Amino acid sequence: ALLRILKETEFKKIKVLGSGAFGTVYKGLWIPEGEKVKIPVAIKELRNKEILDEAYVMASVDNPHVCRLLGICLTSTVQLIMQLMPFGCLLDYVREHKDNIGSQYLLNWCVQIAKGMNYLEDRRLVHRDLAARNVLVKTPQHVKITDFGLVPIKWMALESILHRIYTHQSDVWSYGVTVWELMTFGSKPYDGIPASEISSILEKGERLPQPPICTIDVYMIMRKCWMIDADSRPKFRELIIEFSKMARDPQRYLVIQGDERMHLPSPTDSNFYRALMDEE
Amino acid sequence: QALLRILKETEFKKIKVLGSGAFGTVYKGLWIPEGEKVKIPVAIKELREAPKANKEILDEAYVMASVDNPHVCRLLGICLTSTVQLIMQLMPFGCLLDYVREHKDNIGSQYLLNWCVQIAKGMNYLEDRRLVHRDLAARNVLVKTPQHVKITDFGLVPIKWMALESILHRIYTHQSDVWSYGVTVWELMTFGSKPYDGIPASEISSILEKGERLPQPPICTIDVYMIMRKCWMIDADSRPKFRELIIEFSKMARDPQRYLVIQGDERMHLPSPTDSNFYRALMDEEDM
Ligand SMILES: Nc1ncnc2c1ncn2[C@@H]1O[C@H](COP(=O)(O)OP(=O)(O)NP(=O)(O)O)[C@@H](O)[C@H]1O
Ligand SMILES: Nc1ncnc2c1ncn2[C@@H]1O[C@H](COP(=O)(O)OP(=O)(O)NP(=O)(O)O)[C@@H](O)[C@H]1O
Ligand SMILES: O=C(Nc1nccs1)[C@@H](c1cc(F)ccc1O)N1Cc2ccccc2C1=O
Ligand SMILES: O=C(Nc1nccs1)[C@@H](c1cc(F)ccc1O)N1Cc2ccccc2C1=O
Ligand SMILES: [Mg+2]
Numbered sequence: 001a002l003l004r005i006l007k008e009t010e011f012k013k014i015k016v017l018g019s020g021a022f023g024t025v026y027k028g029l030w031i032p033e034g035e036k037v038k039i040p041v042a043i044k045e046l047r048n049k050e051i052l053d054e055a056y057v058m059a060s061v062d063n064p065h066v067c068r069l070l071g072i073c074l075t076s077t078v079q080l081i082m083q084l085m086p087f088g089c090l091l092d093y094v095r096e097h098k099d100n101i102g103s104q105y106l107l108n109w110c111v112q113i114a115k116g117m118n119y120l121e122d123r124r125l126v127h128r129d130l131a132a133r134n135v136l137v138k139t140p141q142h143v144k145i146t147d148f149g150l151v152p153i154k155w156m157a158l159e160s161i162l163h164r165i166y167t168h169q170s171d172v173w174s175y176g177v178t179v180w181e182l183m184t185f186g187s188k189p190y191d192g193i194p195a196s197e198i199s200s201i202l203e204k205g206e207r208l209p210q211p212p213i214c215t216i217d218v219y220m221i222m223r224k225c226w227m228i229d230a231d232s233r234p235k236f237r238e239l240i241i242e243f244s245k246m247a248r249d250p251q252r253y254l255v256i257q258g259d260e261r262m263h264l265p266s267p268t269d270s271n272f273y274r275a276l277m278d279e280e
Numbered sequence: 281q282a283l284l285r286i287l288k289e290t291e292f293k294k295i296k297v298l299g300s301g302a303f304g305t306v307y308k309g310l311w312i313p314e315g316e317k318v319k320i321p322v323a324i325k326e327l328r329e330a331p332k333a334n335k336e337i338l339d340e341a342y343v344m345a346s347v348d349n350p351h352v353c354r355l356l357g358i359c360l361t362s363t364v365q366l367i368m369q370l371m372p373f374g375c376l377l378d379y380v381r382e383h384k385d386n387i388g389s390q391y392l393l394n395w396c397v398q399i400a401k402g403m404n405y406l407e408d409r410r411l412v413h414r415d416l417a418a419r420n421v422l423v424k425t426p427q428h429v430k431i432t433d434f435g436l437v438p439i440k441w442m443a444l445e446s447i448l449h450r451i452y453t454h455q456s457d458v459w460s461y462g463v464t465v466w467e468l469m470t471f472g473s474k475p476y477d478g479i480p481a482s483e484i485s486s487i488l489e490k491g492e493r494l495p496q497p498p499i500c501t502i503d504v505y506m507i508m509r510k511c512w513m514i515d516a517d518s519r520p521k522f523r524e525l526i527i528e529f530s531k532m533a534r535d536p537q538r539y540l541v542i543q544g545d546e547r548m549h550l551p552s553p554t555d556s557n558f559y560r561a562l563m564d565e566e567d568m
């Protein structure tokens with residue numbers, strides 16, 4: 001219904017964008033038959049036709065902060081088509097802007113990721129791979145969650161490392177690590193520590209260090225996501241409220257040098273961005 | 281208002297040339313948001329002739345940057361260089377004239393009538409905003425997707441699209457726009473034929489007073505051609521209103537094969553919901 005079955009003669013892979021746990025992402029072109037136009041798309045080639053049933057679920061998501069699977073091609077290697085995000089993922093974005101971000105942008109991203117994760121919770125889809133690399137930037141003012149519903153030890157809750165149980169509260173943990181990535185401008189969590197040892201350091205009660213720009217107010221939220229008791233860590237609905245609260249007074253909760261001249265887009269610039277690449 | 285972004289050079293680059301018109305050349309361009317590594321496709325119209333003049337160009341730019349309708353194009357930005365350059369969204373399918381030419385006979389009756397409805401909706405919106413188009417023609421109707429057209433280059437010599445009272449006097453009205461709307465419909469129904477082909481433009485004024493109009497397109501039933509002819513009546517106030525045209529064409533679009541006789545109209549692909557959602561998610565996320 002909302003998933004278009006494509007045939008191989010309708011799209012072309014052009015450039016490789018990256019590789020992850022399961023799949024390689026290409027920049028591609030959609031070639032509508034009978035037409036002379038070439039529309040850019042993102043294609044994930046993976047590494048059971050029932051997969052069609054899985055595809056229908058991701059084609060059925062409806063939220064401004066959740067990516068939708070647009071099409072699939074099954075003739076050979078399973079290929080999936082979704083809208084291409086020219087800004088790439090949020091992780092690469094925040095690294096390349098380590099010097100010019102701003103508290104207003106950072107806190108709003110936390111709101112948007114929480115909104116998307118709450119939507120997935122309402123639909124009872126567990127992400128199982130939330131991380132800054134799986135948050136796509138449509139525009140700098142608008143981020144979207146991807147590759148949900150399907151090796152990454154440093155984002156997994158303790159109950160996911162020891163036992164293989166992924167819950168919405170396990171997603172809350174990975175949400176906490178995702179915020180940490182943003183607040184550290186794309187730092188690698190537990191840098192230098194082998195993944196084999198992360199299981200053990202968490203039971204000793206060691207967490208990720210406090211980001212230098214974070215007040216304790218925001219750091220308490222992050223740490224609250226990493227509590228060993230899954231049912232005691234925050235709910236996504238609460239995260240929306242807290243971060244939305246902080247976004248109404250951003251300089252009070254994030255201490256960034258020069259935070260006054262690198263703030264939210266002007267309405268003229270917002271209208272220009274929106275008419276050009278974000279009309280939803 | 282203040283929906284017009286004043287762009288500076290070095291923020292956009294002209295890449296490919298798309299065409300030239302009465303005053304200006306349109307390029308495919310790239311917007312490079314400052315501080316970013318991204319290349320956003322745009323359409324750029326560089327005018328033809330280069331002070332104080334750009335204060336009225338700016339005043340119109342603010343007006344055209346403020347239109348809000350699904351079937352009316354919006355001016356997005358302007359660059360105030362020697363030659364003024366204008367920025368709007370790039371329509372990769374191009375104008376409706378070239379589209380209907382490259383799909384001659386390959387178009388279904390359902391498509392043709394829907395375009396007439398949408399152009400009328402947009403032209404009625406411009407009337408609601410008290411803006412005279414002054415240049416309605418199939419070349420100034422852009423195809424966003426095949427199911428969605430938008431009006432452009434409004435509110436600013438094309439003798440064969442002008443009402444008689446515009447040729448013999450520079451009087452452009454919403455009712456004179458109704459005339460060019462009729463000529464535009466004729467273009468669509470003839471799959472992009474040239475209007476009054478073979479008659480010199482200097483002589484068009486005289487043939488209209490003698491009562492000669494554009495011929496009936498072979499695919500048009502008598503009902504569709506009668507609307508067209510009412511658009512070209514010498515009495516301006518006797519021509520249809522745009523909202524009446526919306527109602528009329530909407531009625532015919534609910535039974536297109538009753539009003540358009542097209543060979544193979546049963547083998548002519550119609551818009552399927554799966555294809556609609558795919559087109560919209562990729563290039564038409566706007567409300568409609
Ligand atoms: N729709 C898209 N548009 C643009 N770039 C994309 C898109 N999807 C993915 N990418 C890029 O492709 C990279 C790799 O894709 P992916 O296969 O998801 O690996 P990953 O997400 O980074 N790691 P993993 O969580 O294990 O999949 C991402 O980091 C993005 O930079
Ligand atoms: N936004 C756009 N996206 C894509 N193609 C466009 C766009 N605007 C204009 N074009 C193309 O550029 C061509 C030339 O533009 P233009 O200068 O307006 O000439 P024209 O509209 O054909 N004649 P006229 O408008 O009466 O002066 C058009 O015919 C279209 O094919
Ligand atoms: O395709 C995906 N991502 C892509 N990156 C570049 C192009 S597509 C990914 C996905 C996309 C989306 F919009 C929303 C949630 C997701 O989980 N999916 C979907 C799916 C269905 C059946 C089997 C495997 C996968 C799979 O891996
Ligand atoms: O810019 C236009 N067309 C373009 N084609 C390719 C890129 S822009 C055109 C226009 C665009 C639109 F979205 C809606 C209505 C319009 O009248 N305008 C606007 C304007 C303002 C001041 C002086 C001259 C012009 C002028 O020519
Ligand atoms: Mg991924």
Ligand SMILES: [Mg+2]
Binds near residue numbers: 433
């Ligand atoms: Mg034009």
